[PDB]
């Protein structure tokens, strides 16, 4: 009837300590210290999975804006223009264009220039 | 235990009176079950009742006229009720108590 | 409360530095008392006569419908056990691994004969039960046994 407990614990110990090969100190040897850091770690991964979207989008925007401003148009009015023109390309791909092919991006810039309102600060 | 306030089982009055240890509880039978387990009618004693399983074995029996009575029965019990007296009188039977 | 010793507070309550302890045989020690342990107890439970007999009749029906209830007058020639006889006869009558045998008390020779076989598990019909039936595949009644069983139950 008496049930030694060895196996039933060893299992999860093995799991965790496999999943902490790279940590630095008592976070890489000891179950009671790596468990905690696994909590914090998985949590920070979750949060970063939700937020790398905004990170990349920020990046894409900075690239777009600098490209445009070297072609003498602002970001805000560029996107006003593409919205007006019904153009569909997203920012990841506008940035890819900016990097690789600035010519096509300048063409899109010119489209927006054409399709913007005349008197941008009008009361309409 | 109720905090400290005098509980329900210590602030209500006690029930009134006593028991009369020498009480004679009778065990009843009603005429409904007679009619429901004696189609042929006839003599019905304590053992005839014990057979059909309407009372206990060490019973001291009483008879009562709840249900209908059209069968004829020569009932034997200890004590009756006037309703059974009259119902047996109407169905033409022998209410010969002990 | 049954272990040896422990009936003295091993050291102070305060001043020591170490924890608080009241006996040297408490559970958290090494040599200490089991807490909620096994105890000598009974395991029987009171199943009723009607449920039991319903079980047995249903079981015999389960075997009968599938034609596994065989009868027999005897397993042997006069008053000299010989397991080779009974084994050959069960080979004639059966090929399955396991089997039940119902032989009365007086007919001791059949019991003594068939006892030693690997599969067989002999029984008297006065202690006829359900586990011993269901574990089997075939069931060999004696005729005396059937008659006793039937005229004992049926009245």
């Amino acid at each position: 009837a008496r049930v030694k407990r060895a196996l039933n614990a060893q299992k999860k110990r093995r799991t965790v300590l496999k999943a902490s090969k790279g940590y630095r100190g008592q976070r890489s040897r000891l179950y009671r210290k790596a468990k905690e850091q696994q909590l914090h770690s998985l949590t920070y991964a979750y949060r970063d999975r939700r937020a790398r979207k905004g990170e990349f989008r920020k990046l894409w925007i900075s690239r777009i804006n600098a490209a445009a401003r070297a072609n003498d148009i602002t970001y805000n009015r560029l996107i006003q223009g593409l919205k007006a023109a019904g153009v569909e390309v997203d920012r990841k791909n506008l940035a890819e264009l900016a990097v690789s092919d600035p010519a096509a991006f300048t063409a899109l810039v010119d489209v927006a220039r054409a399709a913007l309102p005349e008197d941008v600060n009008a009361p309409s | 235990f109720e905090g400290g306030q005098m509980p329900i089982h210590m602030r209500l009055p006690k029930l009134k009176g006593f028991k009369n240890r020498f009480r004679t509880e009778y065990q009843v039978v009603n005429v409904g079950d007679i009619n429901k387990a004696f189609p042929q009618g006839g003599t019905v004693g304590v053992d005839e009742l014990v057979a059909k399983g309407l009372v206990r074995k060490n019973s001291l029996v009483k008879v009562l006229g709840d249900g209908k009575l059209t069968v004829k029965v020569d009932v034997t019990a200890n004590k009756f009720s006037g309703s059974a007296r009259e119902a047996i009188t109407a169905a033409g039977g022998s209410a010969t108590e002990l | 409360g049954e272990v040896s010793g422990g009936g003295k507070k091993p050291y102070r309550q305060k001043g020591t530095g170490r924890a608080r302890q009241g006996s040297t045989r408490a559970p958290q020690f090494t040599g200490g008392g089991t807490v909620h342990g096994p105890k000598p107890r009974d395991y029987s439970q009171r199943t009723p006569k009607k449920m039991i007999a319903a079980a047995l009749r249903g079981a015999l029906s389960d075997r009968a419908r599938n034609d596994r209830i065989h009868a027999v007058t005897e397993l042997v020639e006069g008053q000299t056990p010989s397991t080779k006889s009974a084994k050959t006869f069960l080979g004639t009558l059966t090929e399955n691994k396991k089997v039940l045998v119902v032989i009365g008390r007086t007919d001791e020779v059949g019991a003594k004969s068939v006892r030693n076989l690997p599969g067989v598990h002999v029984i008297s019909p006065d202690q006829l039960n359900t586990y011993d039936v269901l574990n089997a595949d075939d069931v060999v009644f004696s005729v005396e046994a059937l008659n006793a069983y039937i005229s004992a139950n049926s009245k």
Binding site: - | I8, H9, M10, R11, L12, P13, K14, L15, K16 | -
Partner: protein, 63 residues
């Protein structure tokens, strides 16, 4: 062993046919010199137990 019963709950609580619980009522014994009779009259009889104490009283009566 068995579950022993509560004396007070047996002496100040009974059960009817359909399982109701019954009690008597209070302020009836003494100091009647000034209690009007209507007040003395709604306190007679028996009364069905409340809801809130039914359970407690079951647990006291039975075991």
């Amino acid at each position: 062993p068995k579950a022993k019963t509560h004396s007070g709950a047996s002496k100040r609580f009974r059960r009817t046919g359909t399982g109701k619980i019954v009690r008597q009522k209070a302020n009836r014994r003494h100091l009647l010199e000034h209690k009007p009779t209507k007040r003395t009259r709604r306190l007679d009889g028996r009364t069905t137990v409340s809801a809130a104490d039914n359970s407690r009283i079951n647990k006291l009566l039975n075991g």
